[model samples]
Target: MPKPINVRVTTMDAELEFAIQPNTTGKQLFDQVVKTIGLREVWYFGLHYVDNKGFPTWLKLDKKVSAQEVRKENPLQFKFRAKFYPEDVAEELIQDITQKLFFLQVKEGILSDEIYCPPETAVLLGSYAVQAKFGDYNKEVHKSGYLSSERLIPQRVMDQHKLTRDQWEDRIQVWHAEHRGMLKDNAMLEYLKIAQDLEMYGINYFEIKNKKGTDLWLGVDALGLNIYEKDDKLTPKIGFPWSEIRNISFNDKKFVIKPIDKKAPDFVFYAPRLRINKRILQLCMGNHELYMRRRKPKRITEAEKNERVQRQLLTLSSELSQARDENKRTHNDIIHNENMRQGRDKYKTLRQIRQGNTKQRIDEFEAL
Candidate 1:
């Protein structure tokens, strides 16, 4: 015989009543409600349905209906009600009650989309059910204690279950292997050494001769290859004797490379021109020395830190401005090139058409 289904009733707002049947699912009750009421009427009222515990279980109708429109017919008597089986209700009757409550919400226009319910709520409800039914479900399995009990199984039983401590041990072993690799600093040091060697070799091969018959090499070794600046045109002439350096030197004491000149050698070594440009190098070296000193712990104060931050921000702002200007120029150049291509294509097509027409006329004259 089928088991008797239990029904629970609750009063909502004095006039409206919500009913739930035990052993029922929310989805089944929701479908039953849709069958009772047509979808269009349900969408008008913005109806919603809740479980006995006041959790939003279903929405019947969702639309952009304004409150003003609802109030236009009459004021003072707007009511929203929901009814569904409680999560704690008897399993058999819960299904029937949930269906009826879902129908009520559909009649009122409350729920529509399946995506309305939050995932976290479902997980919480599942956990609650697992806790409530754990004992009963465990008893149904066998004549034994709790299955999750942490007792050692007999060797024969463990073999049947295909269980072992080795699985857990393997996980620990894999974790330690990864941990040890991460702790090894040798890999990073090896990469640094390789970079240093490459930079030294590059500098040796690319060193330039000064006008004063001395060799000069300019490159960054400690900080990697970032310090060296090689000109696109001058790179091929690297390691060559410098005649241009001698012609540009004002004084025979020193030679200098202009920062703005694209064709300038990386560094002027013992060049006669260095006499005039030595001051610039001297100023750069002095500034570098001051920078290093300021980086010391005792030299860095709050005021100095704030000033440095301000200067960095200003520099960044200037760089951004320059980048934006360059980007705009590049965009304009692309547009100009596209327009020129389009014009050339159009002119070529017109010329071909005119030539074809003239040839056709000439053929006709020749036939005559």
Candidate 2:
């Protein structure tokens, strides 16, 4: 008998139902979802499911759903999201649906406090979201109570501010009015454009501790990695752009990021768990790959990306960062010399010994 798997498409405001057998692969279901959504460029999106350990894992398209550590439930649950964000939304993301998904995700992320947003910027973004949702604001149509039911900004910001609800509404209204004549799609695009520059925007945050035992977050995005203090996440204390990173590796819970500058010390932090460290390393590699691809021409096909993934695993296990000498790699001048092999693997790797920990964890979890 086949079991049910429901995928909540956040942008479309709908749930896609599926009946899957034990042998069903993630690709089979992914294709069906893309087919249902009518999306042309399928590479940027992926299906995500929360594991029993409470970590979000990307569905491996080639692996069977049963083989993956999917949580046991009456009906399996999944979310369709933009896995790899486009570097240039205006140029890369052409479809209206894609933009809407990105807009909705960013909006929800802001409201839910997943993505840190400044109070002032939040008000502006809220107005754009309003414009995206309800269209051009009208004095008569959008009365005083119109925004009362709407979630314009994060509740934390509202609670922290001295302004009353009406005062906040007035501020939003002022910004909202400026966006007059802007349609829903354009408004969403505008919202994304503004958000694209924010330090916390499109960042996947992982909680970790520094060498001093102080809590901090490691933010991985399309561009690079950022370090944020536990108290203030809005701004990054330090940022390591992908171009400047020389190597990324982990031993146990300790993760290290080596820089291109020989003078700079290795940035070290510890994840709460080894599992989290593994996920962080994987995200770093995946994001670095996408970042590299965007910098180059867009001639690489989907198949080519898969080939690169395999190549990365093979080359990374043995000869990571070994192709180039450390003395020759300088701070600023090392930018252009990153030809495919040397550049891609420079910021990516997991020691073969540490990589074997996956199988041990897999077997350990399977017994549970």
Candidate 3:
């Protein structure tokens, strides 16, 4: 006799929690449920999915499935059904995937050798990530070029060197003038020039947009030219003849790089901000919630409201997983169908254009 299927029910409105048995087939369960109801579509982490709206939205699977069950016997195959709310479904999926996957990082330039990142570079990259996520370039203040011009430089580093703005600017200017002939020959210098040009044009924002119009933010850092506004006047922060400061070391000879902080005017200031559309904003918030719950190591007892966020993430994860599975299956199906259609078309054409000569055969029979 076949083993009977065991079923268990646990109810939560916002959060989803469940487990399947070892023998349960995720694909089989997905097909059964999808045939009865429908699936939701979502794009996340360069991937797409079709989801069902249950607590822990059940992901549609083919042969390969996502969830693994702990218990051995009396195992259950799970499927979810939920209220059909498109916006909530989209928001939840974006949040869940962003938390689960690493955000793409952008390298300011290719590194010829691995080296510890400078403190200023590290901070600048972090700020870049933040700004890429939420800042709006269309706004007047953001577009005014103050933030992009100064770049990010720590105050401590600026004071420790006992360097003044005028000296730094002079050093940069001299380096650029001397290296004008060598710019094309030096890789590092070429990269710096590219960065400088980007900064000058107020194109400091670096977001990768797909042909479909989805934009993803990436983090990168390298030496580049920058300008700053001081006392309502725009001025170059660091000049480009970089050879003079190339050997200058920081942390008592621990690191070497051209210093921009010392050259930046005291009156100019910069801060991190996010630059994202409404769709990406919803996705980022959802991902943040998931990260706080599952990934964050530090715990704060005072943040009770965050518990609700955890619940929402759980719901979102379930839905997203199902949607992703369905989309994968659908994508494969489309490919398979296309291949089959092409093969059939080729065979039909060959049959119609067979080389046999009907006129010759008829003449031979008639002559015989």
Candidate 4:
């Protein structure tokens, strides 16, 4: 007989657990998840789990599973965890803003090191640099200007896009490994900013040189770039708007930024890192193409819209309940300590009667 195996699903903001007999398919679990979460559409979301070898694996809906595989004898317990990937691929997103949101999620995936598209992982990570040069590609490219889809790619105006995917992928892997340390530091800084509730996406990091011949870190986004004192972009010391720039170019030796004016000084850069310079250039062109693709804002049906509102209300209520619980917790914490809230120390009357005082009173009476 098939026994129950507990399955757990976790998303970015919510978690749920389900139990079922052996051989439950991924699609069935996903259906239950959608029902519980009140989501009418399930595109861009799926389940993932860490395999026995400890590598993360995306769960395919077509397969079945058995309880014995996941069942633990610790208290004879039975439960297996499945991760929820909330972001979808770019091809399916289909809307301008939605596509941009997808890009941001990919950026999140990169930081967490969950990004995996075989032969294209490098392309995915380097796209951030692409967005750095192009400005939030989705938003900027759709406009009537030079970056419009018709002109943005054009073979990167000379056919860089024509290169093979695996080549780009391999190049990305090699260069990325070279810059892995920098990547981790940037990831930590990003998390620090996220902990502080700052922006999480649309950030690209590159190295540049300043007037005094000192090496500096330059951060770029859709609108402009900044010269920060260090990797701590939380407080940038200088800002450069995109309007002042012509183009940012790179070679094996160094990178240079040329302004539109023929006479304006080039914001030349000198990054000693090997392998990443060309990849950075590739990222720029690729993301610029991504920006060019677009469509009108997607409209939701009345029922779907209402369901969304209902879900948001549930979220708000949950947060409110949490706040109320925390408010009660502070008051309840006093049960575990003396001077309760700490104000009792200044006033003896409000403080608890000490046992020593009562014993002293009895002795005093006896003496009298």
Which number leads on lDDT?
Answer: 2
TM-score of each: 0.15, 0.71, 0.17, 0.31
Number of backbone collisions per candidate, in order? 32, 0, 21, 3
- Ordered list by lDDT, greatest first: 2, 4, 3, 1
List residue ranges in candidate 4 displaced over 4 A.
1-200, 211-215, 286-368
Q: Write the per-residue lDDT of candidate 1 for residues 1-368, one digit (tens) a residue.
A: 43333222221212322333434443433344444443222221223333234343222233222211222221112233332111111211223323333333321221121111111111121222222223222234422333233222122222222224443222222222222332223222211221111112112112333443434333311111111123221111122112111222224544343222344433334423432244333323333333333345311212133463234334433433332323323322343335446652222322332343323422322232
| Candidate 3: tens digits of C-alpha lDDT, residues 158-250 | 332334544333322322232333322132222222222221111122243222333322211122212222211112222221211222222
Tens digit per residue, CA lDDT, model 2, 295-317: 78522212234463234334332
Model 1 alpha-carbon drift over 4 Å, by segment: 1-186, 193-207, 214-216, 220-368
lDDT of each: 0.27, 0.67, 0.28, 0.40
Candidate 1 lDDT: 0.27
- The TM-score between candidate 2 and the true structure equals 0.71
Which model is ahead, 2 or 4, in terms of TM-score? Answer: 2
Give the top-scoring candidate (TM-score): 2
On lDDT, who's better, 2 or 3? 2
Q: State how far residue 210 of model 1 sits from its true place (Å).
A: 3.7
lDDT of 4: 0.40
- TM-score-best of 3 and 4: 4
Position 75, candidate 2: lDDT: 71
